[PDB]
Design a binder for this molecule. Structure first.
Ligand SMILES: *[C@@H]1O[C@H](CO)[C@@H](O[C@@H]2O[C@H](CO)[C@@H](O[C@@H]3O[C@H](CO[C@H]4O[C@H](CO)[C@@H](O)[C@H](O)[C@@H]4O)[C@@H](O)[C@H](O[C@H]4O[C@H](CO)[C@@H](O)[C@H](O)[C@@H]4O)[C@@H]3O[C@@H]3OC[C@@H](O)[C@H](O)[C@H]3O)[C@H](O)[C@H]2NC(C)=O)[C@H](O)[C@H]1NC(C)=O
Length: 244
């Protein structure tokens, strides 16, 4: 499995991990030089596994749906935990031999924030936060897990989707930070950006519908075509148009 360990964590090793995560996903080609995910795939190739290891050498394995980069489940090696409403074939295909449990929420941000009783902007990221999240999930506690899963998802799925997010985390190897509204805006608009970039291919680079983001200085900005920085040097994976 593609693996990230905290014992050797550096900015460079984290970037290498995210590159390897991206590379492990099958692609349906590129649009404006950005890889597009598959629309559908056979069950035997539907999931990839990633290992995350804390400072104390304790590992969890997260299962990711290759069609959308969603984490669907994780395992401690002996017990596994599945989100509500994951693809129906996931339990049969993943972590066979473990004791399989269901988490009391779906993996969407609305439901995770409700379960955590706090917002993404209230929850620290950075590699020390990843260490704590791994520990919380390895020693599963129902009250603490949603916040830990929010850390895990943003540090894997969202970093894979956006270079900007990857770099913010890579810049916090020994420190912690709470994500800005710039980060939150990218996460919220991944599907919308994916849709518009694929539409734009048949419209001379023009979006059908604008996407509103927050720039690093906190300004509202309107994205209307593929010449914008978010398209040319940020987004790294597109959700297939079939799923938008
Ligand atoms: C495809 O899309 C691009 C858009 O990415 C099309 O071009 C770009 O359009 C944007 C939006 O209109 C434009 O940005 C704005 O520029 C205004 C002018 O800025 C110049 O002049 C002022 C003085 O008048 C100077 O202060 C500047 O330094 C600069 O020389 C600017 O006033 C706008 O800012 C206002 O809004 C922001 C909030 O978003 C506030 O913060 C400001 O106080 C103002 O109220 C705006 O500037 C952008 O602001 C957000 C920042 O994140 C950006 O970095 C900053 O640019 C771009 O100038 C324009 N880009 C180019 C290269 O032309 C493009 O035509 C289209 N391409 C196609 C169709 O092929």
């Amino acid at each position: 499995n593609v693996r990230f360990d905290l014992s050797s964590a550096t900015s460079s090793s984290y970037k290498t991990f995210i590159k390897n995560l991206r590379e492990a996903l099958p692609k349906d080609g590129k649009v404006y030089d950005i890889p597009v995910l598959l629309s559908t795939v056979m069950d035997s190739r539907r999931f990839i596994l990633i290992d995350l290891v804390n400072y104390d050498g304790q590992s969890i394995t997260a299962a990711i749906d290759v069609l959308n980069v969603y984490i669907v489940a994780y395992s401690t090696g002996t017990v596994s935990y599945f989100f509500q409403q994951v693809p129906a074939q996931a339990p049969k295909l993943l972590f066979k031999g473990t004791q399989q449990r269901t988490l009391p929420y779906t993996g969407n941000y609305e439901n995770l924030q409700t379960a955590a009783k706090k917002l993404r902007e209230n929850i620290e990221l950075g590699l020390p936060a990843l260490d704590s999240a791994i520990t919380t999930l390895f020693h599963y506690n129902a009250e603490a897990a949603a916040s830990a899963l929010l850390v895990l998802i943003q540090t894997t799925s969202e970093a894979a989707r956006f270079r900007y997010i990857e770099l913010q985390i890579a810049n916090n190897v020994g420190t912690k930070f709470k994500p800005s509204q710039t980060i939150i805006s990218l996460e919220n608009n991944w599907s919308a950006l994916s849709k518009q970039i694929q539409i734009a291919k048949n419209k001379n680079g023009q979006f059908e519908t604008p996407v509103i983001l927050i720039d690093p200085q906190g300004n509202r900005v309107q994205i209307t075509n593929v010449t914008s920085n978010v398209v040319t040097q940020n987004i790294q994976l597109l959700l297939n148009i079939g799923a938008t």
